[PDB]
Amino acid sequence: AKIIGGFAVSHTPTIAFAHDANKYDDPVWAPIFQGFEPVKQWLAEQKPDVTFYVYNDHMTSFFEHYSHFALGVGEEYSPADEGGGQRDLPPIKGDPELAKHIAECLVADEFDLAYWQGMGLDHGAFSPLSVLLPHEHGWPCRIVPLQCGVLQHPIPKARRFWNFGRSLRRAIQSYPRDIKVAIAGTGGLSHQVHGERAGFNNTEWDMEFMERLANDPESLLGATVTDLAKKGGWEGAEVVMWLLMRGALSPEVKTLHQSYFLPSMTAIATMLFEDQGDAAPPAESDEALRARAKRELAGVEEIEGTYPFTIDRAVKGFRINHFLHRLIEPDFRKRFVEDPEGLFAESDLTEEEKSLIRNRDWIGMIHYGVIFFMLEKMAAVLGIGNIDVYAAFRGLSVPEFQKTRNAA
């Protein structure tokens, strides 16, 4: 429940390319990689349990359904295929429990979220993270990703991004585990990569931006998209994400390192911030925020025969729910009826999950964490009426369940 500090770093694909091509000795890339060393050092020394990582997906995992604030709630993330195959990096573990605590706090504070699992993290995450963290076999921390829809307008305004972070701060601090959390803000700085203005940069705005974010972040909160894009290029306006990170840190920070390099299209910058704790108690206590985040579902456990589909349940039932969700595909459902065992053997289901499906154990699937709507697809595909499912749930014969209704 302690926030140790935060880091800002650009997230261009070129960082990853330069890492992969081993350009550490390079005349142009050597002082660039050196610019990352203090963050890397800071991260090794401090050993955060979780990094809350703020980035944008570059129209890879987020396109046809494109959200403002997408919290990754899942067990792990692998690098996304972005058009050139999957980068050879190990998957990074998520934190479903922290993520769920964060969702509850943020909803209580009236932020509107999306939740996602199973999708690849693109270079927005894996490019800087590959350079900041050793990953020979695993990664040294867990991750809670927050994908920000900064590309399709309208997007939330600067102050909203800021207010998200303020809320996020209290969210993390009220988490009832004694763990250490770092907050990361990625993308930026000045750049524009489309249209006739492509190739635009503004070092002077970049330096100013870095100073203000560091020491007077409130003075940025009135900037508009038009302002940020005028100053920092079109895609450069993604610095709003840094504001969300800055917003989750103590109102004053110590700037343990900053660096800036502009070798190509994008201003490669980094900033390392040490959290100071709170100069004063927060407006609401950790204990009262916890009880408030819990308020919506307080006393839900007294409702018998009910299994609220909360995040933990979505994560637990993800594999099986994802599998049954594919019944909406004609080929997949044809195979489900005709050759189910071949479909199981290709799948990532546990033997226990396969077993629940094979036995048509309706209540058992409810208990395990299958959401009803996925079971209902399974029933329809198998020609089994919903009434049979309800009777199963109730431990009754079909007619005796039907008796509880009003009309045949």
Check binding of 128 to Fe ion (CB under 5 A): no
Burial class (CB in 10 A: 0-12, 13-18, 19+), 210: buried
Q: How far is the CB of 378 from its own copies (least distance, A)?
A: 8
Nearest to residue 216, comparing CAs of 270, 253, 257? 253
Beta bridge partners of 180: 2
Q: Under DSSP, is residue 256 helix (H, G, I), strand (E, B) or coil?
A: strand
Among 260, 344, 368, 393, binds its own copies (CB under 8 A): 393
Q: How far is the CB of 248 from its own copies (least distance, A)?
A: 17
Choosing from 123, 137, 153, 194, the catalytic residue is 123
Among 183, 314, 356, 357, binds its own copies (CB under 8 A): 314
Burial class (CB in 10 A: 0-12, 13-18, 19+), 393: middle
Side chain identity at 246, as an amino acid letter? R
Check binding of 165 to its own copies (CB under 8 A): no
Check binding of 401 to its own copies (CB under 8 A): yes
Contact map string, positions 344 to 383, toward its own copies, x by CB under 8 A: -------------------x--x----xxxx-xx--xx--
Q: How far is the CB of 342 from its own copies (least distance, A)?
A: 19
Check binding of 263 to its own copies (CB under 8 A): yes
My answer on whether omega of the bond before 71 falls inside 30° of 0, hence cis, is: no
Check binding of 399 to its own copies (CB under 8 A): no
According to CB under 8 A, which residues from 220 to 259 bind its own copies?
Answer: 224-226, 229-230, 234-235
Helical H segments across 72-135, by residue range: 96-108, 123-132
From CA 201, how far away is CA 164, in angstroms rounded?
28
Q: How far is the CB of 103 from its own copies (least distance, A)?
A: 5
Side chain identity at 180, as an amino acid letter? K
Does the annotation count 123 as an active-site position?
Answer: yes
CB nearer to Fe ion: pick between 14 and 56? 56
Alpha carbon distances (Å) from 320 to 274, 316, 374: 42, 9, 9
From CA 329, how far away is CA 322, in angstroms rounded?
12
Q: Copy the structure tokens of residue 172.
A: 């993390």
From CA 326, how far away is CA 398, in angstroms rounded?
28
According to CB under 8 A, which residues from 64 to 123 bind its own copies?
Answer: 64-70, 80-85, 103-104, 107-108, 110-119
Site size toward its own copies, by CB under 8 A: 109
Alpha carbon distances (Å) from 307 to 82, 196, 310, 357, 366: 37, 55, 9, 19, 7
CB nearer to its own copies: pick between 256 and 381? 381
Q: Please choose, out of 85-93, 133-141, 200-208, 234-242, the segment that lies near Fe ion by the rule CB under 5 A.
A: 234-242
According to CB under 5 A, which residues from 49 to 68 bind Fe ion?
Answer: 56
Residue positions annotated with a catalytic role: 123, 191
The residues binding Fe ion (CB under 5 A) are 56, 187, 238
